[PDB]
């Protein structure tokens, strides 16, 4: 309550002035506009009080224009057609055409109301944060009522309709906990298992002495055994950032990869192709 | 019955006070609000008694706000339009616009009611458990009425609409029995069959002496015969956990894989590529 | 007829007691509840007699709760609105809102009625049997009205909505005849045709002396001729089980594969790669 | 006309007995059941005469139960609600709920009527014949009104809904003419063209001396020229069976393939890989 | 005009006999069947004159049965319900059930009317001609109102619903001009360009001396340059037939391919693989 | 204005002859056909004047037949049912069946009106021009109201429904500017960069001395660097034709490809495969 | 306000001339056209004032023709049918046919109103700018109300319907910030890490001395480690243009690629294939 305390008063004088000239007027026309220049301004604070409650400084005011212009009609269309010109003669012709214009504007007022529920109720992002929509990572920079505007990782600008987004799973990197990496690598199946044990102990020591980039808990995983030739391995570890910071994620993971590369060849681990027999005729 | 025993009384005094000033009032207006300041509070306990029956401490109260605000209207709209201002003049104009706002809000009240059936009736998960939605494993951490919030295995946070989830098969790892592994490996077709018999007997002995990780019953399976060169094999066995514990599943299966690797080379089993003839010109 | 012979009587005394105080009452209110505390209990045995006819001990009683609660309304809503408070004043306002709540609950009562036809009329499975839904084999363990609960071959538990299942082809391994195998293998194109004739005669002798696992009728098939190098062959034979018994199917087919492997090398059949010319510069 | 000649008489006595006590009764109630215990039995022979016209001995009688139970209602609901209890008071309340239960049962009476047109009008198969639905060959063994039951080539049993089948192309091997084979093979591009001419003449002689399996007309086709290395060829010929006989088709085509294999090496035709230059450093 | 000149007379005598006993009858019942045993036979020639206009000798008469049986109802249902038993009492009950049976039979009368527009108005084929539906070539042999029956190139018989065909592109080989071939072949990149010029001149001479199979205008096209190793080429030419004649198309194109094969090796053109360096350790 | 100046007169005499015998007739029947043999011929010039405005000489006249036959009904059905036989008795029965035949013919009058907007308003092609629909290039040769008839590049004739085409992107080669080529080629990564500079200067000189086929502006592009082995390059240039002329495009691009081929080997550019180490055991 | 200040006057004289001959006429017909030759010209400035507000000089005037012709009807159809010929006799027959022509023209007035919201409200592009629709880059050159016309990168012209575009994500290169490049390259895993450090320092120096094409900030990224053989790397950098300038983007990136190529071989970096063991028999 900040402005309703002083602006609802501007409807309150007319709430006083429709009780004034009803007793002095009835000791019908000007009697019946005083309650319709009031029925608007009471329908006007139900706007401003149920819209000083609400999730975007662009879409809240593109919404305010929308309910103002449909409550500056259901005042007027009940002023003339329900309070001055007498009822039930033209009151049931415009309701064919009102019902007729909901074969035209009906499906696109359906998409406007599903976009208001996506933006204000479901609310999966704010301006400024990096999101994933199909597998495409995209930064938000404008939220309108019918469209979100995104930037891609190459800075290309995308216009996406909010009613199509309202049926999809959306990721948000800004609202996430600190996120995890994968680095994969392959070694020879005939690596001794004491060298796989020294490799694991040496990975874990690299991550303990870099606490500012990596969390301490990790795992080294064997994923496949191929042709009795190849072990496919992976390392799982945790960042101290999310993937909101795209450039910093790529740089820290480049440096982890080049450190694994150096451990593998201090320990004399490699990979070799399967031998081939040749029958020479 | 805990609070209805003392809060239904707050409707009961008004059930006494509408029988009071009907006899003293009829030895119409204030007669006709006493049954509408009652018709609400009887429609209010049908809320609180059919909602102290119900499957989320966030969604039960986001639901309570929803039926409270539509039963704080079908009290008022039958107070004014069916109990004070006399009927059948404005009683059949608002029902065009009521029918008109179900070309707007109709499809999105359809998705709100399908999301309430998914959450409270179908109920496939609770907060805290790991689920699979397309092939993506995802931990639940917030259940709302229109959206479930998930975390992925890299801790990325996903906002998924509940009306799209209500048409899909959903797995739940927490509600499962103890789950099974597969480890695949390939050996040479000309492996003698006494070495395949020693391999099977040595696999089964590893699983019997590790009862805390593996169940005793398992099977070793030949899946293909390729080019008279390669036998493709698999081992099926059972965990003593489900896949809810993701990090522990990967670690126990890494250790099973490195044990198969060591059996295969104690028994001198290998795999070799097919020979090649060379005609040298 | 077991309980209807003694429980329809509890409606029959009220069928006697509405003919009693109609003659003593007419030598309107208490006259008009005696036929509505009867119209329920006659609408109650049409429940219990057309539901002691029916295909799940969980879904029959989750269904009984559903028709009981809509026949404990179309008693009451014709008691008050068609037998006590006089007609055609409020009788045509609630039928806007009744028609209004079929933009909300209408599509989800459509899916409830398609799920009752799938479960009770189409009836493709029972609890306990192994089924195939897309290519995924799945054991049934709970049939509800809106959801079937499955277990996969790794024991992961799946919640599948019955209205999506009602549009798919569903296999049932339990209701099947004894099922057939395929084992494929490849041999060299320049295998003499007297060795293919000894191979066929030796396959058929293995299947005749194992009658407890294999049926006698089978076929050995040539499927492709490749590059004048490779014959792709298959063996088709029949189990004495269905694929309901998953672990036993895999074990018996592993033993057939290792027996083919031993026939092929008693007969000196192999496969070789195409030769290569080398021009040495 | 076999049973209608003697069973329409059982409506004819009541056609005589409603003309009897209309003149002796009018020299209203028992007058108005005599034409409704008649209006059924005339609506009963329009059943039995337009259903002794009709394409399955299971589905004709699952259909007879269906129209009997909706003509044992539109007798009764015009007996009570249009011939005894006087009109236009309850005659326009049940038609809200009748219109209400076509938001529930309406889409599933839509699928029941599309399944009756598929089974009886479109009629693409009978019980006992082998059909192809997506590329899957399937034998029919039960035709119901809502589901067809199939067996696959491994004897797995499939339950397929008839309303999904009614939108697909369906093949029928039993209703087909005698069907054609393809056998493909590859030869060397530098095969002389007099050897391709002897091969064609020797294929055609094999098919003339086996008239009981193969038709005489055939074609030998060159499909591609690859890398100036490989000619891809095919032989097209005709069976004296359809593919209804699955096991016999596979056996006769295995024997054609092994005969092509023997012609190719009597004529000294082969295939060789492209040569390779080696620069030895 | 052949039969309407003598069969419209059989309605004309009743056009004379309803003007006869209206003056002798009015100097109401038998007055009001004479105009309904006329209103049919005038509605009967509007059938036979607007159906002796029309595109299949099976579907025209399966259609004639369909409009005869709905004009042998809208005679009777306006005879009894609009010309004998007096109006507006039962005239507005059957129109609930008439409106009710268009939730049942409505979607399948929608597919019957879209199939009549496909067959008679869009008309993309006749019986006997070879068509392409997805990439599958198929000969037409029966056109019904709801289904077309096809044969494939292996003589398998397909039942295809006409309402699914009405949304697809359909090719017709019989209605086409004479159609074109492609033969592809690959040569070595280091082929001199005077040999590519002799090859083109020798292709064009083969096509000029075979005018009965090939049109004179053609083109020889270079499609790719690969790895400075391979030129991918094609020859485009024209048949003197369409692809309706499937067996003759395959035979003439086999003979063109074997002639290209012989030109290429008279001109000493070939293709060779890229050389390989070997470092021998 | 050419024929409306003399043919609207044939309605004008009847505009004079309905004002004639209204004063001599009223100093009701023949009074009420003179305004309905007029209401047609005024509704007839609104046809011929709003259809001498309109984009196909086949579809304009297949359209003229369509609006003539629905304005030769809404003359007659307001002649008999609104100007001779008196109103509001049969005026509200045919409007059930009129509303009934829009469950039958309603969806196919929806596709007829979307096809008229595609053909006359959207208008993406004319007869005679080459278009691309999915990636298939197709020449137009007949435009009807419900179907376009195309020819493919092999002269196969396609019947495509206009309501499916109205939802797709359609290319038009005839309405295009002069179109561009791509020729790709690969060279060795260790090509010196002075040879890539001479190649570019020699490409550009070929295009300047052939101005009748190629525009002067072009670009030579490096697209990938592969394995430090291969540069993948492309040349982009412009035709002086569109791709309407299919045979001429293929011939001019064959000659550009064979000219690039000759530049590359005057400059001694090639491509070689990566070397291989051999450890000889 | 430019022309409304002088053209609303042309309605204002008729606003003066309907107040003139109402007092001189009433001291009904010509009284009732003066308010309908006024009701148009007041409905005419609500056109010109709410359309001198509005996003294309072709579509604004193709829109002006559209609302002019539906406000030159809802003047006339309320002139004759609501102000001259008296009401409620023909006032409720044309509203069947008005409701009937919204089974015909209803879905295509739905697509016209969704195309007006795409063009004027969502507004994702203007004429002249390069956009991406599926992955296809396309220059805009005509915006109509129902169709956008595009040119592709080869100058092929595409006609795309605006109602299909209104459901897709659309990129706009003209409205973007300066955009980013990727160049990928592969090096040998056994490259020393001091050579990867000199490569990074030498890349960054090339980008600093070319400020007119490249931004200074960049990153060099290791993406995979393959088989202990290959490092897959990438360089990310920024243009000083967007991809609107297609030809200039390709030329600047060709020159960056040829500069990386020259750094790699000044530093003696390469890539080699994995060695092979040969067992020579």
From Swiss-Prot, chains A, B, C, D, E, F, G:
Origin superkingdom: Eukaryota
Tissue expression summary: Detected in the root tip and throughout the vasculature of the root and leaf.
Chain's gene name: MSL10
Native source species: Arabidopsis thaliana (Mouse-ear cress)
Protein name: Mechanosensitive ion channel protein 10
Annotated function: Mechanosensitive channel that opens in response to stretch forces in the membrane lipid bilayer.
Transmembrane stretches, start-end: 66-86, 101-121
Compartment annotation: Cell membrane
Family the entry assigns: Belongs to the MscS (TC 1.A.23) family.
